[PDB]
Amino acid sequence: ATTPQTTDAPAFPSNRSCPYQLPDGYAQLRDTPGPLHRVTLYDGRQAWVVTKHEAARKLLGDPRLSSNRTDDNFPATSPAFEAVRESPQAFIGLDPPEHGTRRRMTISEFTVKRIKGMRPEVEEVVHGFLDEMLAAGPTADLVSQFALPVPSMVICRLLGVPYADHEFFQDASKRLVQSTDAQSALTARNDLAGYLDGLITQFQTEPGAGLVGALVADQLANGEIDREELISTAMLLLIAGHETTASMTSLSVITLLDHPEQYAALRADRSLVPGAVEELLRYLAIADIAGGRVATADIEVEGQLIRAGEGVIVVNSIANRDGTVYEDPDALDIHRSARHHLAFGFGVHQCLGQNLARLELEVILNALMDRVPTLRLAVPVEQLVLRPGTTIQGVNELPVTWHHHH
């Protein structure tokens, strides 16, 4: 090469170097005027990304932006995503009206009433794993010993997946979400699909509790959902149900320990916890791989033209750092109003599990402050290995220690 390498479509996604700040490239996008920006995906395709808060709400509500993953022009951010692409879709990949007919089969499990009613169960699960970790003595891996098991046990009960098989499906879920190549991603999905097919057949003998048992005994027995779809739907809920909250827990611990005055204020006044959870959601925005869209018609946005067949990624981490919405947006402030953040999306696909996630993180933070207020990282912040921007944000390992008490 013998010419400058500046490009008007930088590589996307980018990797975080700090868990709670944007990648520098993302900061550059945040500062570029306009709602949209060109980028180049891993294979060479260019696509649009959305980089401003209001425009992200508007485009997430635009029916000309389809969630159809199996569309040829759907933006793929890694060779692994094309596992979810050439696979039968759960409702996260459907458009209305099909999307609502499938999502409505699951919503009874996620109502505000039901979630509020799970609080004692979540508290029991959180405190049990906390006990086992603390009794095991420092040091510890917060991911394997706490952040992952807690939401796994909860979502497994919700679904009717037996927690006994946790080692299998927890490992399979890891391999699907984080793979760098396509085939290891396909294999993880097919191990999962295979396990899920057996559970249905098992339900097809003795009716079990949980959402999967319910969908087997009703919608499936009425032909209203296909077996492939039920598997896909159960897989989406299982994986989302435990990988997202696990990442929020580990990244929130890292973040709070870098803001000790806010963490101390939080411990001193537990009425701040719900607002702190909202702020952490806005600030950490762990699900950026959760904004892909493909346009089925030309879309004009503020003087820029999205043409039919162009991919669009609504990047909610950047949108949540829009300073015309959140004053001083790169500062963590558990007292701020984080209302209207996009960590959960917006519109018809807005996160089904959002209030379960909020409940989990409130109980988790309270239990950590109750039972191990001296928790600290057993390594410095820049000895941690963060995941790349091609997957759910977080850490695969979080070595922690505490002052032992008896």
Ligand code: HEM
């Ligand atoms: C803990 C933090 C969580 C975050 C930050 C998060 C983030 C998101 C985002 C951004 C979307 C939108 C995807 C899109 O627009 O294409 C989404 C959708 C979804 N989330 Fe969550 N999620 C979290 C927890 C959960 C939990 C605990 C569940 C439990 C099952 C869950 C289940 C779902 C489902 C099923 C959808 C698809 C909804 C639809 O397409 O109608 N999420 N999530």
Ligand SMILES: O=C(O)c1ccccc1Nc1cccc(C(F)(F)F)c1
């Ligand atoms: O997007 C799919 O189709 C998907 C399929 C199978 C399993 C998980 C899937 N998605 C997924 C995986 C992790 C976190 C989130 C989300 F952030 F949206 F909640 C979504």
